[PDB]
């Protein structure tokens, strides 16, 4: 369960996000939709405490900021530096870094998870490649593989279906369905309004405030979308 209380984030003068109170239940694949730049992606950063925010957030009778080991955050591809010298397997292994303490190294059991995570997303033969050499769809699968090795009960993605090939989308989506089958919560910030009932069983419509929230067929309506995107 992801409960939120009066979460707000200020851009500079006006509020980017305004008083978000919500209670999300799992297991689920939930979709955060709405206009670009109007709260979607900020909600995830304010929830995890990545940026300064005014409200609170909880994960199962415990605060989110004291439970970051239970969450896996997958950021947008745009933010990541592709020129940085790093192989695919080394990028995937970054997900294991929290579990490794100081004065310790990655043993053979840890590389087992990296080799298994790549096989799940179909990048076993791209292990020694540089991340600059991969395509947009392939690179998302590396970030999903990096997320899998954390073994989080909660998964937070940010526009993972934005600008990718259909072969990657199939692999990514099948992986997320399996996480829901494993009794885990998936919260995705969707880039547009494509395939809403296919991707998501719960939908959270956002434009500064929460316009609507609930199961897809009920909440993904003509009226709610007009209220969100139409603004006035």
């Amino acid at each position: 369960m992801i409960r939120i209380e009066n979460l707000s984030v200020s851009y500079k003068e006006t509020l980017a996000l305004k008083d978000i109170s919500l209670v999300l239940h799992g297991p689920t694949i939930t979709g955060i939709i709405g206009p670009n730049g109007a709260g979607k992606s900020t909600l995830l950063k304010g929830m995890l405490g990545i940026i300064p925010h005014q409200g609170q957030a909880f994960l199962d009778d415990k605060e989110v900021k004291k439970s970051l080991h239970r969450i896996a955050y997958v950021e947008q591809k745009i933010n990541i530096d592709y020129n940085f010298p790093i192989k695919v397997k080394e990028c995937v292994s970054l997900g294991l870094f929290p579990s490794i303490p100081l004065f310790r190294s990655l043993k053979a059991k840890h590389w087992k998870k990296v080799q298994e995570a790549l096989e799940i997303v179909g990048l076993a033969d791209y292990a020694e490649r540089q991340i600059s050499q991969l395509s947009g769809g392939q690179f998302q699968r590396v970030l999903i593989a990096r997320c899998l090795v954390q073994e989080a009960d909660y998964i937070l993605l940010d526009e993972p279906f934005a600008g990718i090939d259909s072969v990657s989308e199939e692999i990514i989506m099948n992986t997320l369905r399996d996480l829901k089958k494993a009794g885990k919560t998936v919260l995705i910030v969707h880039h547009d309004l494509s395939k809403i009932p296919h991707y998501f069983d719960q939908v959270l419509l956002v434009n500064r405030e929460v316009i609507a929230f609930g199961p897809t067929k009920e909440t993904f309506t003509e009226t709610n979308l007009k209220e969100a995107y139409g603004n006035q």
Partner: protein, 272 residues
């Protein structure tokens, strides 16, 4: 030329210490330098070096260790920069330039009262050909401490430089490693006062790193190459300065720049 240099390294004592000190500065500045250019701190690297001068100057007057004053005045500049941004209209690049030039001017005056102008020149541009034993052992000691700190927090410095946004999501103290990295920077700065000098430290930080950045397929590989190009440039630079009787500090920088110029064309990644 080469025979005279090898003969000099056996008979002359300062040339032996000049070689050893130049190797250590080249290795450590190369390793730290990788993190500087990958995180986009090349500008801040130059400013911190200038901010070290008033600390090292004031440290000699009070009779303290140069490292203490450098860390204090080094981080003071960084604190002033952010304070200018947050409490005024002045932008970042202007605020960095103002504080570094102001601190450098403050350092020149503070050196002027206690020390002479020849001492100011040596702190600012090298004195590679007259480093003492006590200075060499301190350089090797502090230089080893920098390499150890990088080795201990390698995974933590890796993940924060590459994907800081993921490190924040994992709950890592991202500011701690940012300040740790700036402490290493100030330790290299005072260490570099016995080869290239305060003004040309940035060159030995970023140029060997940028050269290694053209070849490297990992951070560990990059640090190895950056320290190799840093060490080799420091050796050949000393050879040029010794043989032709010219500024060795500048000869070391030009040698590092020449490797970069060559690597710009011949590197596999630059071709494809």
């Amino acid at each position: 030329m080469i025979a005279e240099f090898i003969d000099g390294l056996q008979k002359f004592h300062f040339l032996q210490n000049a070689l050893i000190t130049a190797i250590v500065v080249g290795i450590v500045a190369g390793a730290v330098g990788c993190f500087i250019i990958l995180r986009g701190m090349s500008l801040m690297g130059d400013a911190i070096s200038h901010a070290v001068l008033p600390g090292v100057a004031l440290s000699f007057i009070l009779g303290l260790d140069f490292f203490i004053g450098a860390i204090v005045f080094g981080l003071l500049a960084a604190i002033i920069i952010t304070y200018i941004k947050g409490n005024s209209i002045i932008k970042s690049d202007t605020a960095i330039g103002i504080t570094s030039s102001s601190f450098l001017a403050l350092g020149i005056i503070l050196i002027g009262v206690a020390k002479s102008s020849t001492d100011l020149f040596h702190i600012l541009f090298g004195n590679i050909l007259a480093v003492q034993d006590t200075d060499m052992f301190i350089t090797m000691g502090v230089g080893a401490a920098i390499l150890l700190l990088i080795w201990i927090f390698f995974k933590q410095l890796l993940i924060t430089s590459f994907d800081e946004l993921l490190a924040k999501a994992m709950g890592m103290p991202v500011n701690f490693y940012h300040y740790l990295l700036m402490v290493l920077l100030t330790l290299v700065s005072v260490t570099a006062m016995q080869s290239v000098g305060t003004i040309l430290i940035v060159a030995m930080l970023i140029t060997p790193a940028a050269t290694a950045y053209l070849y490297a397929n990992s951070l560990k590989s990059m640090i190895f190459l950056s320290s190799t190009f840093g060490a080799t440039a420091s050796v050949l630079g000393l050879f040029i300065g010794y043989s032709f009787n010219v500024a060795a500090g500048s000869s070391i920088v030009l040698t590092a720049a020449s490797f970069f110029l060559i690597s710009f064309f011949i590197a596999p990644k630059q071709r494809y």
